[PDB]
């Protein structure tokens, strides 16, 4: 954890609570504009303080390192701790620092991604049907522990499709779907 | 030319090479097969 | 400047700074730690018992660029590389 | 009797034992009993003993000779032997471990990651055995590869293999899966009888018949089988019968691997492809009587060739007239499978009985297809079927409208023919492979026929004459005038011959306006193959093929036409009338060289005395070549002043005709013959000194002359001299042999991406596909035929226009893809369904459909195919903006009809084109790899220096994206706009060590002390662009850490304003002289800071943009790192970061990885390729199409067949299939060619049946 | 450079006894070579049917040929009588079923059967299928 | 020439000169080491 | 919502191009060829002295072709396609046809 990262992860942190707001909602950049962020930084126990600007809802998580982690519930806690881990594992609440050595969630080659309701998966499921019996199409893959898997993340929704909103140069935008597979 | 290679005559240069006309190409043949018939005849006699 | 090293990790050097430049590619022609000096000098200033210890940081930045800049108004020099000026080639390649 | 599964599997012992043909000699009597006897099968003039059949009917049977006690090793799977050695204890024979013993874990109720962790365990064991039965060590068996037997590292020691047989053979069934055993370990040893193969694969060989060199292996074998030896001689004699190449290293002997050595293998050389039996190759040549569905035949090969007639109700009697006429050259007989060849008066005519379903064979007619082709084939364009038309001579005669898409000429080309007769074969060739159907190109969709050479200067001509009388007119015309109209007019104008052969009223922004050419003059872009305004292009999209090609062939009989009438010629007073110009250019370069070089002096001999300091190499380099180019320059604009002159004085110059007309002739080409030559370059550099400092000794020791170093003055008219020849040559030859090299590699690229693309094609729903994975929702975008949809302007949201909310809120949901390349590219162009602009006609504001009708008729169209084509899935809200834009009631007005039609053509469009089965992967690699093979060898692409990290342009870019090699060094690039976060990393990473400042070291002893002194000036620290402390620095920073210095003590002096003295006091360890000439010697290149690269690491700027009218300005850096964890401490907040595939898919993810190699594969190949983005997005499509990247030079995710691994060229994938026990189905292209089946590809995606009701309710 | 030295034509001829194909040699009347280039631009047109039998063995060289579909082994004829020995020594009772392939590739495959490769190949047996009258549709815009 | 719709123009690249068909195939210790 | 999805893609089956008129033509034509019996109307010695291509066209467009294609799980006639692209297609094949002297 030092004091450059946090900045970065502040910025994860409030996709976070998008998510967190309205399991449905698009994730990008821009979301960004709706928030604002406050930073106290130390060696043991970092807070951040995200904030919903016409809601004026705080939301206050506290990042540890791995190693040490001293977790009290405080005022409006996200529930759960931060964790900053040294290699990449599976859970939504721990991030490796190779996640943050830049400012990840500002380059032009973050995604813009959704979450699929269940009209829009029946659709896609009947979509995938060959018209031959049963015999269906597979989406590609997609591994489990990526970042956009961990900012998708609610506890009572497991998360089989994810959409994407491709830049495309001579279309504007263009739409994919990808499946999620777990890794042990 | 450790320390000035570029100044130094490369190995691909015409400076440092000879070329073989018709008469070398007998001539080293010659020098071969005498020498392998001088051989032979060494070995012969040893053996014998 | 913060510690940014290398390792055997193409080039093309003058030949007479490539030697230096990969011996020094070499971990095992450092010590493990460093070495004080240990030959006495710039016996005018005390501001040097003031870097040499405890200042371990970007103050002792700060006192060595104050060290730099003193040395150079003692001689009488501007002290400010941005200061001074380079000298213009176009007026020897303008032509045409 | 459809072959639809093949399953992979090792014989069992006893499937050996069981023949009745026992081999037991070297030699007999009758051969009877050895490795040669007839009962294995027929040979040269003898049936076979066993079924009695000759060789055309016999395929072999098996034999066995028998081997005693003699265990023996199957040579491709000895590796696997020892795989199998390292799980076990040799010893006992048990596992290495001791949990898989134990009754309270059940391994049938877990797999995967149970299984992998419990013999990850198994293996990392390697202990002393566990077990107490022997408590033994373990041990490492390897093949010996000098003995042919299995020796141990420890001790030298011989292993047998009756020992690993025993021990291999007691592991339980119920602990296979851990060791990953599928069948058997007993099936890997021959143990009673070693089989003898049949004689179909080793026939006697011919040119008295040699022996086969398989025979000879096997009859070796069998020579120390009988004479009870031991097993190292039987195993080295199997070895080298089987794979020689197991123990030895040569690789010319002959044995059972031979089939699949290398490239050579068999499935490559005779089952994907072969010789056939009706086939010819002749040089080509033109025919002005031949159009372009046509191609002529020579005599001699009319009279060979042999064309199918079918018995059947409706031609008996024909054939029977044939017979009578001495006609029909061959018969066959169906219902005795007999083929006769039917003399002339030599043969009998009752022999003959003309069954149904018979046929006769006679000599070739015209109008028959036939298949014919150029080689090299790069596209589809290169293999079509024409109709046969009798010519003259012996070379097969081609239209000049076909060349371009062949690639062919006539300086002594050649083509080859085939004929297939198959009924089938016939109506596919008549209707897929006729030329008429292959106008549009796949990708871009211009036409791939049309004019060449002097055609053009013609048309640009025929355009622009005047005063044509009626009489002038209809002889230009020839067999066309027929329905030319004269309608009141006595004097008619070249425009007026355009109109008429433009029979059609349509409008197109540019070039046409009531089917009226409207631009100034006709040029290659409108009669050339493959350009962007071509006519015939037009006229296709207007109504179809058919008139596209009419107007081909039309406009080319006029234009030659008009060249039989006029003539055109170039001649020698038409480039050099006379010597003033030349004179006067030449005076000019005379002057200003020596200008230059004056100049050079003048600095050389300021720096030699001391009034400046000298440059840097690298900007004196930089200061010369700026002058030379500004002369350059000037030659340009002295060629480009005196075209326009003469143009001026002499309108009629045919040289200037072929400048304007577009063909071949520019002001750079005039200025080599007629200016000056200009810089020669060797990798975007001159050329290098040898020997004194110089290239030739023409010139002095070190000389500086330009003139020396590859500057050519003079033109080809006024004669090149010896050296400026000699830097010509350097420059052609080099070109001729990188042209090789690049022949050499595109090849196998090009193979590479064809064989892994080749089964990808669109579904029964428009879809993108491959095996049984979903691609792409939409085909094209827009489920529409590639050909057909149109590039358009894109229009930018304003204030002006009629629906501006609406159009505004659509740019806002799709913009986002449109500023690319890292903010410094805005969209020029969107993808139209259609082509839409030849339907459009403004109307006169009355008698034009209301605005709020035409909105209601869009949106809803739209809507309607949303939700019935794309399925509720796919966004088109471009195909609404192009359309909103468009037809924009402030920009035209339009009557309800255009409105109707226009959308009609649109759910034609969307209904007839696009259909299931379409090879759109094939194609599209065929495209790539034509673009990347032709840009090589004609040197497209120049070589440039460059002072910052660059991602280069070519082949071998394109190479290294695909191959997708890991650790290696990325070049990131860092954007922001706050300069200094970049100035810290500049300063950091940037590399600098002393003797790149021109040090002035010098050394001095006294007592107890060495007293070196280090002088720099200033100039070049501020050009560094570093401090004084810097250097500073990195001194004490490499003297405190050194290991040869032992005390030291440093101090720092101001010489004067423009120097600075750095002192060491030093005093060095022992031994003393030898560590001092060596520190001495590395001070200048070890006191340095920053990451060693051959790239400095400047800072640029450049305008960047938010949107299409909000604009920025950006400061950029580039640097190469193995990663991203230097940067880590650095407060790279708010800086945009791009770096490369593995960073960013280990970061961000598969999707972005897929960007990424989208658009760096779409750059490699230059400016002007934008077309070739939809075929470069399906290839990065493929290559991430599982979660990870995947390169193309391995099947590694993908579920490829056996036997699609085999012709890829594996080598070894049979036997890992063998070993796995594998079970396929066969689907692929190279699976259903192994099998003579139909692909699924085209008209064989679907399935076919015949109905018989009807035929069943006749009655007779 | 003279054209009457590069002409070549065939129409039928001799074939290479290993594989069975046409010979080589301009002055040996063999045969233009179809190589995999052109392969890949017929199967670029859509024309499955004409690369199907420009690949396959020519149509008058047809002939009965049976595979046991127990062991792959090309069953032998004695007396009349298909019958695969190997099975049949085994005292099994495998079908015999006919095969329409190229020769080169039972050669490839009794090569593979050397090295100890064993290959085998099942058949599609799906059940009959019977058509139904299907209604209409227009698939026409309403204008 | 002139330009119309130069921000869709196609540029050819096409060889002038290709290379014609193939015709019918039809110890004295006295060399380096040279390692 | 999987029914009308199915009833969109069940609707979409029925558009046709070039590729499968082109496999009808091809299967009917090698029957033809090889000795089968037409289908046409008022078949009689008359029918065996035109041409064989003029016999598969009359057989299409009078709704007695044998042929039967698979394309999505479903069976159809050469006459349960779109109309109006059967049409279209055809008169392309046709005008080509008579370019080549077949028809
Ligand atoms: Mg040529
Ligand atoms: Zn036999
Ligand atoms: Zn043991
Ligand atoms: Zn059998």
């Given amino acids: 954890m030092n004091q450059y990262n946090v900045k970065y992860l502040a910025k994860i942190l409030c996709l976070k609570t998008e998510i967190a707001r309205d399991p449905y909602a698009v994730i990008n950049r821009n979301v960004l504009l709706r928030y604002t962020t406050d930073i106290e930084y130390n060696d043991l126990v970092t807070l951040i303080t995200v904030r919903h600007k016409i809601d004026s809802m705080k939301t206050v998580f506290q990042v540890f390192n791995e190693s040490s982690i001293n977790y009290t519930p405080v005022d ?109 | 030319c450790i320390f000035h290679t570029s100044r130094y005559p490369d190995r691909d240069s015409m400076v440092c090479h000879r070329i073989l006309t018709y008469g070398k190409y007998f001539e080293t043949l010659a020098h071969d097969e005498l020498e392998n018939y001088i051989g032979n005849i060494r070995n012969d006699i040893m053996n014998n | 400047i913060k510690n940014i090293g290398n390792t055997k990790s193409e080039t093309k050097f003058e030949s007479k700074n490539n030697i230096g430049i990969e011996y020094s590619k070499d971990s095992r022609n450092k010590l493990s730690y460093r070495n004080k000096p240990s030959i006495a000098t710039n016996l005018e200033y005390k501001t040097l018992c003031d870097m040499i210890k405890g200042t371990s940081g970007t103050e002792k930045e700060f006192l060595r660029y104050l060290l730099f800049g003193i040395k150079c108004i003692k001689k009488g020099v501007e002290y400010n590389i941005d200061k001074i000026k380079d000298v213009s080639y176009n007026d020897y390649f303008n032509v045409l | 009797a459809v072959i639809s599964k093949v399953t992979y599997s090792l014989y069992d012992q006893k499937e050996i034992n069981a023949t009745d043909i026992i081999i037991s000699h070297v030699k007999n009597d009758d051969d009877i009993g050895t490795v040669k006897d007839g009962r294995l099968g027929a040979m040269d003039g003898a049936l076979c003993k066993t079924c009695g059949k000759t060789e055309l009917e016999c395929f072999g049977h098996w034999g066995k000779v028998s081997i005693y006690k003699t265990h023996i090793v199957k040579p491709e799977f000895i590796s696997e032997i020892i795989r199998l050695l390292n799980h076990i204890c040799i010893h006992c024979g048990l596992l290495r471990s001791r949990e898989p013993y134990s009754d309270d874990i059940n391994l049938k109720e877990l797999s995967g990651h149970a299984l992998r962790r419990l013999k990850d365990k198994i293996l990392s064991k390697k202990k002393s055995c566990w077990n107490s039965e022997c408590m033994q060590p373990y041990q490492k068996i390897t093949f010996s590869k000098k003995k042919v037997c299995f020796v141990n590292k420890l001790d030298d020691i011989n292993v047998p293999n009756s020992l690993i047989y025993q021990k291999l053979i007691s592991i339980h069934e119920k602990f296979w899966p851990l060791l990953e055993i599928h069948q058997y370990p007993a099936n890997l040893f021959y143990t009673d009888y070693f089989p003898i193969p049949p004689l179909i694969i080793r026939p006697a060989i011919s040119f008295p018949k040699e022996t086969n060199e398989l025979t000879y292996l096997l009859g070796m074998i069998v020579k120390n089988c009988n004479l009870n030896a031991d097993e190292q001689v039987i195993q080295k004699a199997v070895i080298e019968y089987d794979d020689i190449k197991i123990i030895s290293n040569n690789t010319t002997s002959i044995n059972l691997s031979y089939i699949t050595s290398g490239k050579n293998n068999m499935i490559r ?212 005038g027929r329905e030319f109209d004269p309608k009141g007019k006595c004097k008619f104008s070249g425009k007026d011959i355009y109109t008429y052969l433009i029979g059609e009223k349509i409008n197109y922004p540019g070039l046409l306006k009531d089917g009226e050419i409207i631009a100034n003059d006709v040029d290659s ?56 110009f030349t004179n006067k250019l030449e005076a000019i370069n005379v002057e200003k060289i020596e200008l230059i070089k004056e100049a050079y002096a003048k600095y050389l001999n300021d720096v030699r005395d001391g009034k400046i300091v000298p440059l840097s190499k690298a900007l004196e380099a930089d200061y010369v070549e700026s002058m030379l180019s500004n002369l350059t320059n000037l030659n340009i604009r002295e060629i480009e002043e005196h075209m326009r002159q003469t143009l001026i004085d002499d309108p009629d110059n045919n040289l200037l005709k072929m400048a304007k007309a577009g063909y071949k002739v520019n002001p750079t080409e005039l200025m080599y013959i007629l200016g000056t030559y200009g810089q020669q370059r060797i990798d975007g550099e001159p050329a290098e000194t040898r020997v004194l400092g110089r290239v030739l000794p023409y010139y002095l020791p070190d000389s500086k002359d330009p003139e020396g170093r590859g500057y050519i003055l003079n033109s080809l008219t006024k004669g090149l001299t010896g050296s400026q020849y000699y830097f010509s040559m350097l420059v052609a030859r080099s070109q001729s042999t990188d042209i090789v090299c690049e022949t050499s590699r595109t090849g196998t690229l090009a193979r ?27 085909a094209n975008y827009t489920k529409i035929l590639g050909s057909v949809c149109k590039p358009v302007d894109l229009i930018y949201p304003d204030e002006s226009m009629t629906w501006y909310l609406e159009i505004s809120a659509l740019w806002n949901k799709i913009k986002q893809g449109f500023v690319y390349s890292q903010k410094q590219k805005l969209a020029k162009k969107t993808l139209a369904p259609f082509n839409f602009l030849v339907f459009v006609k403004p109307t006169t504001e009355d008698n034009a459909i209301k605005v709020k009708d035409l909105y209601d008729m869009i949106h809803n169209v739209i809507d309607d195919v949303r939700e019935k084509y794309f399925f509720t899935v796919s966004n088109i809200d471009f195909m609404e903006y192009i359309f909103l834009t468009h037809l924009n009631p402030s920009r035209i007005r339009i009557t309800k009809e255009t409105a109707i039609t226009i959308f009609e053509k649109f759910y034609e469009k969307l209904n007839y084109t696009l259909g299931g089965g379409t ?70 990473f940037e590399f600098v060590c002393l003797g790149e400042l021109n040090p002035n070291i010098t050394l001095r002893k006294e007592t107890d002390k060495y007293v ?15 401090t004084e402390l810097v250097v500073e620095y990195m001194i004490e920073r490499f003297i405190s850490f050194s290991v040869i210095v032992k005390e030291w003590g440093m101090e720092t002096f101001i010489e004067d304003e423009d120097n600075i003295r750095f002192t060491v006091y030093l005093n060095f360890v022992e031994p003393e002289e030898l560590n ?57 907040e708010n800086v945009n970061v791009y770096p490369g595939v593995w960073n960013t898919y280990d970061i961000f993810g598969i999707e972005a990885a897929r960007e990424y190699l989208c658009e760096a594969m779409l750059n490699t190949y230059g400016e002007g390729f934008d077309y070739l983005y939809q075929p470069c997005d399906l290839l990065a499509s493929l290559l991430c199409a599982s979660y990870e990247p995947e390169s193309v030079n391995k099947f590694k995710f993908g579920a490829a067949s056996t036997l699609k691994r085999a012709t890829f060229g594996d080598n070894k994938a049979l036997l890992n299939a063998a070993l796995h026990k594998k079970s396929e189905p066969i689907n692929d292209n190279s699976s259903c060619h192994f099998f003579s089946k139909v692909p699924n590809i085209g008209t064989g995606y679907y399935k076919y049946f015949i109905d018989l009701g009807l035929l069943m309710r006749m009655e007779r | 450079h003279l054209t009457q030295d590069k002409a070549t034509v065939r129409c039928r001829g001799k074939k290479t006894k290993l594989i069975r194909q046409a010979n080589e040699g301009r002055k040996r009347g063999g045969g233009i070579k179809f190589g995999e280039m052109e392969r890949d631009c017929l199967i670029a047109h859509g024309a499955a049917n004409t690369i199907t039998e420009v690949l396959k063995d020519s149509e008058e060289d047809y002939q009965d040929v049976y595979v046991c579909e127990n062991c792959g082994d090309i069953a032998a004829q004695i007396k009349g009588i298909n019958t695969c020995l190997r099975c049949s020594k085994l005292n099994l009772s495998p079908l015999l079923t006919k095969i329409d392939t190229t020769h080169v590739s039972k050669v490839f495959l009794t090569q593979m059967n050397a090295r100890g490769v064993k290959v085998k190949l099942d058949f599609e047996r799906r059940p009959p299928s019977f058509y139904k009258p299907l209604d209409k549709v227009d698939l026409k815009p309403s204008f | 020439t002139q330009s119309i719709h130069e921000n869709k123009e196609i540029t050819e690249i096409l060889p002038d000169n290709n290379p014609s068909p193939p015709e019918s195939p039809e110890d004295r210790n006295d060399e380096p080491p040279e390692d | 919502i999987g029914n009308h999805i199915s009833a969109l893609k069940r609707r979409y089956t029925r558009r046709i191009s070039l590729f499968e008129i082109a496999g009808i033509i091809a299967e009917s034509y090698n029957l033809l060829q090889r000795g089968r019996l037409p289908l046409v109307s008022e078949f009689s010695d008359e029918t065996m002295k035109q041409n064989m291509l003029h016999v598969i066209i009359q057989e299409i467009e009078e709704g007695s072709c044998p042929i039967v294609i698979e394309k999505n799980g479903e069976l159809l006639s050469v006459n349960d396609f779109d109309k109006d692209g059967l049409k279209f297609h055809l008169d392309y094949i046709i005008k080509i046809w008579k370019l080549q002297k077949r028809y």
Avoid at chain 4, 1012 to 1021: E, G, T
Wanted: proline content about 3%.
């Fill in chain 4, 525 to 580: 872009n409108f009669v050339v193959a493959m350009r962007h305004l071509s006519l015939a292009g037009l006229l296709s999209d207007h109504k179809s093929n058919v008139e596209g090609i009419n107007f081909i062939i039309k406009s080319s009989y006029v234009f030659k036409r008009y060249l039989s009438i006029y003539g055109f010629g170039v001649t020698f007073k038409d480039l050099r009338p006379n010597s003033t």
């Fill in chain 4, 919 to 988: 090879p759109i992967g094939i194609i599209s690699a065929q495209v790539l790899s034509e673009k990347f093979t032709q840009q090589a060898l004609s040197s497209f692409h120049t070589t440039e220096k460059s002072g910052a990290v660059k991602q280069k342009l070519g082949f071998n870019e394109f190479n290294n994206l695909t191959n997708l090699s890991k650790n290696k060094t990325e070049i990131i690039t860092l954007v922001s706009d706050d300069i200094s976060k970049l100035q810290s990393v500049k300063i950091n």
């Fill in chain 4, 1076 to 1132: 001092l000439s060596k520190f001495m010697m590395v001070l200048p290149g070890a006191a340095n800071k920053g990451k060693i690269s051959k790239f400095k690491i400047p800072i640029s700027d450049y305008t960047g943009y938010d949107d299409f009218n909000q604009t920025k300005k950006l400061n950029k850096m580039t640097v190469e790192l193995m990663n991203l964890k230097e940067l880590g401490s650095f407060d790279l």
């Fill in chain 1, 76 to 184: 409006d806690d996200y529930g759960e701790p931060i964790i900053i881990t040294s290699y990449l594992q599976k859970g939504h609440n721990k991030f490796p620092v190779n996640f943050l050595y830049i400012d990840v969630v500002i380059s032009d080659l973050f995604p813009s991604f959704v979450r699929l309701d269940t009209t829009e998966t029946n659709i896609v499921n009947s979509v995938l049907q060959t018209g031959d019996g049963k015999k269906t199409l597979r989406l590609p893959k997609m591994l489990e522990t990526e970042i956009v898997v961990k900012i998708l993340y609610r506890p009572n929704i497991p998360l089989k499709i994810v959409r994407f909103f491709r830049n495309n140069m001579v279309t504007g935008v263009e739409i994919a779907d990808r499946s999620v597979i777990s890794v042990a």
């Fill in chain 4, 1012 to 1026: 070196v002194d280090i002088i720099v000036n200033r100039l070049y620290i501020k050009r560094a662009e570093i």
């Fill in chain 4, 269 to 480: 050389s005779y089952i994907v492809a072969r010789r056939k039996d009706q086939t010819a190759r002749s040089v080509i040549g033109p025919s002005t009587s031949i159009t372009v569905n046509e191609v002529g035949m020579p005599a001699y090969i009319r009279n060979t060739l042999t064309e199918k007639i079918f018995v059947n109700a409706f031609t008996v009697d024909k054939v029977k007239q044939l017979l009578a006429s001495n006609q029909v050259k061959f018969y066959f007989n169906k219902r005795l499978n007999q083929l006769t060849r039917i003399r002339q008066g030599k043969f009998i005519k009752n022999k003959i009985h003309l069954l149904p379903g018979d046929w006769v064979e006679v000599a070739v007619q015209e109008y028959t297809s036939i298949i014919f082709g150029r080689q090299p084939s790069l596209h589809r364009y290169n293999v079509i079927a024409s109709s046969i038309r009798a010519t003259e001579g012996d070379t097969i005669k081609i239209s000049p409208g076909i060349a371009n898409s062949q690639n062919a000429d006539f300086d002594g080309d050649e083509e080859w023919m085939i004929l297939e007769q198959n009924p089938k074969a016939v109506i596919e060739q008549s209707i897929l492979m006729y030329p008429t159907t292959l106008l549009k190109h796949d990708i871009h969709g211009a036409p791939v026929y049309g004019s060449i050479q002097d055609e053009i200067v013609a048309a640009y001509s025929l355009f622009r004459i005047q005063d044509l009388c009626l009489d002038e007119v209809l002889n230009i015309l020839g067999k066309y």
């Fill in chain 4, 752 to 778: 590479k991406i064809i064989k892994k693309m080749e089964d990808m094609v669109v579904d029964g729903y428009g879809q993108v596909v491959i095996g049984n994975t979903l691609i792409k929702y939409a």
